[PDB]
Coordinates of C-alpha atoms in Angstrom, one line a residue:
Chain A
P4 CA -57.1 74.0 -81.9
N5 CA -54.2 73.2 -79.6
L6 CA -51.3 72.0 -81.7
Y7 CA -48.6 69.6 -80.5
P8 CA -45.3 69.1 -82.3
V9 CA -44.5 65.5 -83.5
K10 CA -40.9 64.4 -83.9
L11 CA -39.3 61.3 -85.3
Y12 CA -36.2 60.3 -83.3
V13 CA -33.8 58.6 -85.6
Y14 CA -31.1 56.2 -84.4
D15 CA -28.4 54.5 -86.5
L16 CA -28.0 51.3 -84.5
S17 CA -24.8 50.6 -86.4
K18 CA -23.3 54.0 -85.3
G19 CA -21.8 54.5 -88.7
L20 CA -20.5 51.0 -89.1
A21 CA -23.1 50.0 -91.6
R22 CA -22.0 53.0 -93.7
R23 CA -18.6 51.6 -94.4
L24 CA -19.1 47.9 -94.0
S25 CA -22.3 47.8 -96.1
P26 CA -20.4 47.7 -99.4
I27 CA -18.3 44.8 -98.2
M28 CA -21.2 42.7 -96.8
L29 CA -24.2 43.4 -99.0
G30 CA -22.3 44.9 -102.0
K31 CA -24.6 47.9 -101.8
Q32 CA -24.2 51.3 -100.1
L33 CA -26.5 51.7 -97.0
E34 CA -26.2 54.7 -94.8
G35 CA -27.4 53.1 -91.6
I36 CA -29.5 50.6 -89.6
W37 CA -32.4 52.9 -88.8
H38 CA -34.3 52.6 -85.6
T39 CA -36.9 55.3 -85.1
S40 CA -39.4 56.4 -82.5
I41 CA -42.2 59.0 -82.2
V42 CA -41.7 61.8 -79.7
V43 CA -44.9 63.7 -78.8
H44 CA -46.4 65.1 -75.6
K45 CA -42.9 65.2 -74.0
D46 CA -42.5 61.4 -74.3
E47 CA -40.8 58.9 -76.7
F48 CA -42.8 56.0 -78.0
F49 CA -41.5 52.9 -79.9
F50 CA -42.4 49.3 -80.7
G51 CA -40.2 46.3 -80.0
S52 CA -40.4 42.6 -79.1
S53 CA -41.9 43.7 -75.8
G54 CA -44.6 45.6 -77.6
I55 CA -45.3 49.3 -77.4
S56 CA -43.1 51.1 -74.9
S57 CA -42.4 54.7 -73.8
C58 CA -39.5 56.5 -72.1
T59 CA -38.3 60.1 -71.6
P60 CA -36.9 61.2 -75.0
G61 CA -33.4 59.8 -75.6
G62 CA -34.0 57.7 -72.5
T63 CA -33.2 54.2 -73.8
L64 CA -29.8 52.4 -73.7
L65 CA -29.2 53.8 -77.2
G66 CA -28.7 57.3 -75.7
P67 CA -29.4 60.5 -77.7
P68 CA -30.8 60.1 -81.2
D69 CA -28.6 60.7 -84.2
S70 CA -31.2 62.9 -85.7
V71 CA -34.5 64.6 -84.7
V72 CA -36.9 64.9 -87.6
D73 CA -39.9 67.2 -87.6
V74 CA -43.0 65.3 -88.7
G75 CA -45.6 68.0 -88.1
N76 CA -48.2 69.0 -85.6
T77 CA -51.1 67.0 -84.2
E78 CA -54.3 67.9 -82.5
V79 CA -54.5 64.5 -80.8
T80 CA -54.3 65.0 -77.0
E81 CA -52.3 63.0 -74.6
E82 CA -55.3 60.9 -73.2
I83 CA -56.6 60.2 -76.7
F84 CA -53.0 59.3 -77.8
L85 CA -52.5 56.7 -75.0
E86 CA -55.9 55.2 -75.8
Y87 CA -54.8 55.0 -79.4
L88 CA -51.5 53.3 -78.5
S89 CA -53.3 51.0 -76.1
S90 CA -55.7 50.0 -78.9
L91 CA -52.8 49.2 -81.3
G92 CA -50.9 47.3 -78.6
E93 CA -53.9 44.9 -78.2
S94 CA -54.4 44.4 -81.9
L95 CA -51.6 44.7 -84.4
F96 CA -48.7 45.7 -82.2
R97 CA -48.5 43.1 -79.5
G98 CA -44.9 42.0 -79.0
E99 CA -45.6 38.7 -80.8
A100 CA -46.2 40.7 -84.0
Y101 CA -42.7 42.1 -84.2
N102 CA -40.8 41.2 -87.5
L103 CA -37.4 42.7 -88.5
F104 CA -38.5 43.1 -92.1
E105 CA -42.3 43.7 -92.2
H106 CA -43.5 44.8 -88.7
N107 CA -40.7 46.6 -86.9
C108 CA -40.1 49.8 -85.0
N109 CA -40.3 51.8 -88.2
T110 CA -43.6 50.1 -89.2
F111 CA -44.9 51.4 -85.9
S112 CA -43.6 55.0 -86.2
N113 CA -44.8 55.3 -89.8
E114 CA -48.3 54.3 -88.9
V115 CA -48.3 56.5 -85.8
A116 CA -47.0 59.5 -87.8
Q117 CA -49.8 59.0 -90.4
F118 CA -52.4 58.9 -87.7
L119 CA -51.1 62.0 -85.9
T120 CA -50.2 64.1 -88.9
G121 CA -51.5 62.4 -92.0
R122 CA -47.9 62.1 -93.2
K123 CA -45.7 59.0 -93.7
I124 CA -42.0 58.9 -92.6
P125 CA -39.3 58.8 -95.3
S126 CA -39.0 55.7 -97.5
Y127 CA -35.3 55.4 -97.1
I128 CA -36.0 54.4 -93.5
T129 CA -39.0 52.0 -94.2
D130 CA -37.5 50.5 -97.3
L131 CA -34.2 49.5 -95.6
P132 CA -35.4 45.9 -94.9
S133 CA -36.2 45.2 -98.6
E134 CA -32.9 46.7 -99.6
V135 CA -31.1 44.1 -97.4
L136 CA -33.4 41.3 -98.5
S137 CA -32.8 41.9 -102.2
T138 CA -29.2 40.7 -101.9
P139 CA -27.4 37.4 -101.7
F140 CA -26.4 38.4 -98.2
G141 CA -30.0 39.0 -97.2
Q142 CA -31.3 35.8 -98.9
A143 CA -28.6 33.7 -97.1
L144 CA -29.3 35.2 -93.7
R145 CA -33.1 35.5 -94.1
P146 CA -33.7 32.6 -91.6
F147 CA -31.5 34.3 -89.0
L148 CA -32.7 37.8 -89.7
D149 CA -36.3 36.7 -89.4
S150 CA -35.3 35.3 -86.0
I151 CA -34.2 38.7 -84.8
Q152 CA -36.3 40.7 -82.4
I153 CA -35.3 44.2 -81.3
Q154 CA -36.1 45.8 -78.0
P155 CA -33.9 48.7 -76.7
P156 CA -33.9 48.5 -72.9
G157 CA -35.0 51.5 -70.9
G158 CA -38.7 51.8 -71.7
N159 CA -41.8 50.6 -69.9
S160 CA -45.0 49.1 -71.4
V161 CA -47.9 51.2 -72.4
Chain B
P23 CA -31.6 2.6 -65.4
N24 CA -33.1 3.7 -68.7
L25 CA -30.7 5.9 -70.6
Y26 CA -31.7 8.6 -73.0
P27 CA -29.2 10.1 -75.5
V28 CA -28.8 13.9 -75.3
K29 CA -27.8 15.9 -78.3
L30 CA -26.8 19.5 -78.8
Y31 CA -28.0 20.8 -82.1
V32 CA -25.6 23.4 -83.5
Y33 CA -26.6 26.1 -85.9
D34 CA -24.4 28.7 -87.5
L35 CA -26.9 31.6 -87.9
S36 CA -24.5 33.3 -90.3
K37 CA -24.4 30.2 -92.6
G38 CA -20.6 30.6 -93.0
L39 CA -20.7 34.4 -93.6
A40 CA -19.3 35.2 -90.1
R41 CA -16.4 32.9 -91.1
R42 CA -15.1 35.2 -93.9
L43 CA -16.5 38.6 -92.9
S44 CA -15.4 38.3 -89.2
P45 CA -11.8 39.4 -89.9
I46 CA -13.1 42.4 -91.8
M47 CA -15.6 43.5 -89.1
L48 CA -14.1 42.5 -85.8
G49 CA -10.5 42.1 -86.9
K50 CA -10.6 38.6 -85.4
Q51 CA -11.3 35.1 -86.8
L52 CA -14.7 33.7 -85.6
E53 CA -16.0 30.5 -87.1
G54 CA -19.7 31.2 -86.7
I55 CA -22.7 32.8 -84.9
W56 CA -23.6 29.7 -82.8
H57 CA -27.2 29.1 -81.9
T58 CA -27.7 25.8 -80.1
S59 CA -30.6 23.7 -78.7
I60 CA -31.0 20.5 -76.7
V61 CA -32.5 17.5 -78.4
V62 CA -33.7 14.8 -76.0
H63 CA -36.8 12.5 -75.8
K64 CA -37.3 13.0 -79.6
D65 CA -37.9 16.8 -79.2
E66 CA -35.8 19.9 -79.7
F67 CA -35.7 22.5 -76.9
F68 CA -34.4 26.1 -77.0
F69 CA -34.6 29.5 -75.3
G70 CA -35.4 32.8 -77.0
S71 CA -37.2 36.1 -76.5
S72 CA -40.5 34.0 -76.2
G73 CA -39.0 31.9 -73.5
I74 CA -38.5 28.2 -73.6
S75 CA -39.9 26.6 -76.7
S76 CA -39.9 23.1 -78.3
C77 CA -40.3 21.7 -81.8
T78 CA -39.6 18.5 -83.7
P79 CA -35.8 18.3 -84.2
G80 CA -34.7 20.6 -87.1
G81 CA -38.2 22.0 -87.1
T82 CA -37.6 25.7 -86.8
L83 CA -37.2 28.2 -89.7
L84 CA -33.5 27.6 -89.4
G85 CA -33.9 24.1 -91.0
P86 CA -31.5 21.2 -90.3
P87 CA -28.7 21.9 -87.8
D88 CA -25.1 22.4 -89.1
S89 CA -23.9 19.9 -86.6
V90 CA -25.3 17.4 -84.1
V91 CA -23.1 17.0 -81.1
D92 CA -23.4 14.1 -78.6
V93 CA -23.6 15.4 -75.1
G94 CA -24.2 12.1 -73.3
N95 CA -27.0 10.1 -71.8
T96 CA -29.5 11.1 -69.1
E97 CA -31.7 9.2 -66.8
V98 CA -34.2 12.1 -66.5
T99 CA -37.5 11.0 -67.9
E100 CA -39.8 13.0 -70.2
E101 CA -42.3 14.0 -67.5
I102 CA -39.5 15.0 -65.1
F103 CA -37.8 16.9 -67.9
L104 CA -40.9 19.0 -68.8
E105 CA -41.4 19.8 -65.1
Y106 CA -37.8 20.9 -65.0
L107 CA -38.1 23.1 -68.1
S108 CA -41.4 24.5 -66.7
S109 CA -39.6 25.4 -63.5
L110 CA -36.8 27.2 -65.4
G111 CA -39.4 29.0 -67.6
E112 CA -41.0 30.5 -64.5
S113 CA -37.8 31.6 -62.8
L114 CA -34.6 32.3 -64.7
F115 CA -35.7 31.7 -68.2
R116 CA -38.8 33.8 -68.8
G117 CA -38.6 35.5 -72.2
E118 CA -37.9 38.8 -70.4
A119 CA -34.5 37.4 -69.2
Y120 CA -33.1 36.9 -72.7
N121 CA -29.8 38.7 -73.3
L122 CA -27.6 38.3 -76.4
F123 CA -24.4 38.3 -74.3
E124 CA -25.2 36.8 -70.9
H125 CA -28.5 34.9 -71.0
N126 CA -29.0 33.5 -74.5
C127 CA -30.0 30.2 -76.2
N128 CA -26.5 28.8 -75.4
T129 CA -26.8 29.8 -71.7
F130 CA -29.9 27.7 -71.7
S131 CA -28.5 24.7 -73.5
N132 CA -25.4 24.7 -71.3
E133 CA -27.3 24.7 -68.1
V134 CA -29.7 22.1 -69.4
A135 CA -26.8 19.9 -70.5
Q136 CA -25.2 20.2 -67.1
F137 CA -28.5 19.1 -65.4
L138 CA -29.1 16.2 -67.7
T139 CA -25.6 14.9 -68.0
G140 CA -23.3 16.7 -65.6
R141 CA -21.4 18.1 -68.6
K142 CA -21.1 21.7 -69.9
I143 CA -21.2 22.4 -73.7
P144 CA -18.0 23.7 -75.4
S145 CA -16.5 27.0 -74.4
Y146 CA -16.0 28.1 -78.1
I147 CA -19.8 28.3 -78.2
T148 CA -20.5 30.0 -74.9
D149 CA -17.5 32.3 -75.0
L150 CA -18.6 33.8 -78.4
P151 CA -20.4 36.8 -76.9
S152 CA -17.3 37.9 -74.9
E153 CA -15.1 37.5 -78.0
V154 CA -17.3 39.9 -79.9
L155 CA -17.5 42.3 -76.9
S156 CA -13.7 42.5 -76.5
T157 CA -13.3 44.4 -79.7
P158 CA -13.8 48.0 -80.9
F159 CA -16.6 46.6 -83.1
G160 CA -18.4 45.1 -80.1
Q161 CA -17.9 48.1 -77.8
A162 CA -19.4 50.4 -80.5
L163 CA -22.4 48.2 -81.2
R164 CA -22.9 47.2 -77.5
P165 CA -26.1 49.3 -77.2
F166 CA -27.5 47.8 -80.4
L167 CA -26.4 44.2 -79.6
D168 CA -27.9 44.4 -76.1
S169 CA -31.2 45.4 -77.8
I170 CA -31.1 42.2 -79.9
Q171 CA -33.5 39.4 -79.0
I172 CA -33.4 36.1 -80.9
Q173 CA -36.4 33.8 -81.4
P174 CA -36.3 31.3 -84.4
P175 CA -39.9 30.8 -85.5
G176 CA -41.5 27.3 -85.5
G177 CA -41.6 26.4 -81.9
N178 CA -44.3 26.5 -79.3
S179 CA -44.1 27.5 -75.6
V180 CA -43.4 24.9 -72.9

């Protein structure tokens, strides 16, 4: 069977700022504000307030990823993958469903990784929202944080 | 002529946190992360990633506003106002046009206030984005900040 490498592009939206300012804001040590995407079949795929989008790898306003993580290989072909993403985009991943804490770019990548390789992405990435929420900081800014939508420019709808 | 009071609902999304943590993040004293809306004809109107929305005053997830500011009176009736908002929503205020720095909830309220009363809202509110941008903090997080969309839940499309 033809095998296609699957990568998880990792971006620290805070560019290291969350690393030092996290103890002074949340009183807890966070290593970054993780934004991830799935790179497969030569293209980068992510979910934001605009829904599922794609771009050439490292092609958003965010620039090159801070880390490229190997997820595994998948047998899912390009045409089957696009059909899969299309199906998600019309059901559980419309732009309206975006939520900073429970339905974000990492929720997307995690579910996509599982589908393509049977593996989930690292908990330190997906658990970030709960780590922020479980603090006075997070509880006070909950209303504001729940109002936040993220959509890195540069991609086009799938 | 029938006169209708126009209010500017002011919300500090940071709930006072920006007040104390601003000197330690931006090295400059900011008093809040201002989110505003226009209240007229018994309803609250605002612009977000979803476009122009309305709700009963203080009816979003943000709760009651931190301050209610008197803008002035307007002679524009309800039906004419909705037509006005509809026109904006189809031209310069579609959800896609939202930008944290140059086309946000305050850009909307300011333009709406000017139309209804001939007055602009206070510069300390509208100039906030530039104040954050003119700092190492802002320049480093520019990519991330430009990816931020804001849409307080609770309203419905106009």
